[PDB]
Amino acid sequence: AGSHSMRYFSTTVSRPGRGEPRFIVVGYVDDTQFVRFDSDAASPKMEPRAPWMEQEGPEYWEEQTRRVKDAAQTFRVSLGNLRGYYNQSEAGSHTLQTMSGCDLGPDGRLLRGYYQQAYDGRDYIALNEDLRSWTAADEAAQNTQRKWEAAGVAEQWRAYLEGECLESLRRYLENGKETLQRAEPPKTHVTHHPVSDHEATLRCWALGFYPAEITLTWQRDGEDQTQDTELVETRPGGDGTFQKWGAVVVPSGEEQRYTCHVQHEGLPEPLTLRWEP
Amino acid sequence: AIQRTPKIQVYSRHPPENGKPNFLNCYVSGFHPSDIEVDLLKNGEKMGKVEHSDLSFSKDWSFYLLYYTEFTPNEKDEYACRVNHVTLSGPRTVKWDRDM
């Protein structure tokens, strides 16, 4: 589509008295992973996880490894600060997650830049859209916010998000263009399985699509049935595509009242499907 | 700390055709904290050759993982995924249903 994104997702987990916190980072362009770092690996290094990343040279990888090791050290200090802030025991394991990245608009502009953290799975602090202010979840995060305003942290992220973040995303989008600039439409069909002699399950399938965003809804005479729909979470095929289905259990004589509506970027028109007996 | 129980889906990469090679997938999502144990089960026995994705997480900060192995289905063999997490009584086993 016109908008494309880059994201880094990092997870830091303390394991008190049991060595340094575990630190894992993964990078994504849109819904395609392209790098990883695992601090518990044999030789912890940023390394490629897409074939179109295998043409970067070793100096790129060294710089990426240096940056994540630097971040890892900051996140370990953060975990200690947070435990102290929340008056938590030194024996318990805690998690710091961070997200960062950019949305690149169709004309090359920065649509949105991000830097935010969660502590033990709850929002903690976030860079606002203006890339010059913060939103803090509580007084602990207001403490973090002050230390970050004192160290000029917003300005440093704004510089990267408006510059190197987009430049890198553009390069990846060109290097992996055949993978990343495709919209693979879902292959769709409806199945029918009786549950008695008087009712049946209609299941609407979408398979093999990319990117992951999709809408799949059952309607009965044009009326949305989400309260009666079993809709599974979009799931990876393992091969760079995604799968999803939604299902309703309906009276046999009403089956043709039901339609499944599929919307995906790779589709010229939204689809309307009906059980094809 | 927040705790979120894993969702579990067991499925094949491609529509299962007996005798045709394929990939058996166990997608585990929506969970927190991140420590988890996942096994793929060929007839109630652990499978070797099982690989898994790198730990990542969704907009709500919950984690997801793909566990997968190449396989070739047939009329006999039963397959399943077994997950243990701190939000669970103990290991939960989910059978592979061909039409889900």
Ligand SMILES: CCCCCCCCCCCCCCCC(=O)OC[C@H](O)CO
């Ligand atoms: C959500 C994780 C991102 C946070 C770190 C964890 C690993 C990130 C690897 C490098 C990508 C982003 C780092 C870019 C480095 C960078 O330019 O620094 C930014 C600001 O300038 C503040 O210093």
Ligand SMILES: [Zn+2]
């Ligand atoms: Zn060097």
